């Protein structure tokens, strides 16, 4: 059930990754769930590049690039978090709607 049971867990993570995103209240939790979604897509990707495409790996390289960009985004978002917590002394996300 290798090729079949893992994909059955991709969605069962991806979905959760979205839900925690929407119902998130603090910035760090939203970023965590974002990273979780990216890892879900990564996992949905890799298995495809193990059943087939073994002559020239086309998924593992793409997985590497996805992880690199995930790290970059997780750096930039937290950097923005620093400045927002500097401006206002609380990072409650859903209590800032002064741009509407």
């Amino acid at each position: 059930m290798m090729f079949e049971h893992v994909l059955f867990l991709s969605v069962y993570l991806f979905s959760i990754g979205i839900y925690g995103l929407i119902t998130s209240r603090n910035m760090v939790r939203a970023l965590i769930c974002l990273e979780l979604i990216l890892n879900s897509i990564n996992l949905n990707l890799v298995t495809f590049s193990d059943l087939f495409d073994s002559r020239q790996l086309k998924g593992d390289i793409f997985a590497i690039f996805v992880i690199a960009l995930a790290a970059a985004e997780a750096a930039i978002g937290l950097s923005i978090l620093s400045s927002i917590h500097r401006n206002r002394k609380s990072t409650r996300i859903n209590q800032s709607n002064l741009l509407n």
Binding site: F14, I18, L21, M27, A30, L34, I37, L38, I41, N44, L45, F48, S49, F52, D53, K58, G59, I61, F62, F65, V66, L69, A72, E73, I76, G77, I80, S83, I84, R86, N87, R88, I93, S96, L98, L99, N100
Partner: protein
Amino acid sequence: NGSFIFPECILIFGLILLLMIDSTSDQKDRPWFYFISSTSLVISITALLFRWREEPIISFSGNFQTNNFNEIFQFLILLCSTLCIPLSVEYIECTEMAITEFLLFVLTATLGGMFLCGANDLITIFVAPECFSLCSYLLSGYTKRDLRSNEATMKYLLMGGASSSILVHGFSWLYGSSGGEIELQEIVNGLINTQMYNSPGISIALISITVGLGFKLSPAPFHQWTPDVYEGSPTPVVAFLSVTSKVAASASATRILDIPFYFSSNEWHLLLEILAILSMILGNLLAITQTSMKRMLAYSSIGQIGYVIIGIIVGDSNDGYASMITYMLFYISMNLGTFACIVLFGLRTGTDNIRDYAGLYMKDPFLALSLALCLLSLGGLPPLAGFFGKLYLFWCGWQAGLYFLVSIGLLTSVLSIYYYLKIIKLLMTGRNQEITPYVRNYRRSNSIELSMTVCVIASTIPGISMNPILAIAQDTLF
């Protein structure tokens, strides 16, 4: 070992120079790099001038692209950046922020947009949207002491992460169902030797791609992120986004939807239509009720105007792409003109809301005139350029059968005339006891003047001189 990146290798050279000068030089930079970056941009434009009338030759190991149609957009993004930088020099100058890394960010985002215009690789066309988005949450929030510039980083980063996520998940579904393939051309083969094409699957990897595409250029059902960010970020980066993001997204969309999606036409031609019919409606109604200038521009010039561009992507038998190129060339100018005028007046006064533009015709008439011209052009009135743009967009698009999209377009254009004429009316007035003490103290009076005046006549002349532009835009096969 290849000159098809040299148009971007020059940009990389200029980037490295801009990063070096701050490391080495002390203080001689402020007006120096202001033109040293323009040197790199104009040199890249000259380099792209060479590859006019060239072959569809494939890239490094067949990675990004090199044909005529893609080269058009590759030059167009450079044009946008060249016009935009002089705006986003003096603005951030009059904020006491570091200017070096701002120009570095703008240059790197332009580089990402330039690479995106090709990218027939399924991976390059994923990193390049990130090279264009990772350099966007920075600019769109690069005024830290402000408060709104943080809201328009939260509700831009979260959204642009979720959407790129959905897009790459669609890409993974495609890579799976396609028996394993990345090269954009080589999918309809590989999706056949693996006989899983007509099956469910592909139907999912089409929607999970079209949604991530839409978010990047914001039609109606996903427009939610645009009105906020365009108000929260500084006006120059608003203009830069609202021109080059749309250009790059519309350059990537046609290729990612026409090359690997021969068969699914009747199932995405409809889909995009559902977006367009909404994009040119919900992006106009709200535009009426606005009172802020940047937010009204977000609604009108983007929320709607990203309608009739698409209005031929659905109705395209390669007899229309010329009209898309022409309308993009018109829209870039007719949008950068009004953004230049808005930046200039806002800096000179210190307000954004509409109710302060009163009497501006009497204090300084040149700026009022050069703003009214661009606004009317956006309205699409006969002697101007937007009229001929919308016209040749409809005349090829009514010539392709579909009727319940041209009528809605004309109707929403008539509707859009309203707020344009509203602000125009607010310009021409002389009721001295009405004008607020903002235009009353206006010492009327280089770069921004030059940009505004050479960008506004291109909003009146090409609409009447579209013959060579049309003759040029017909040679696009991609």
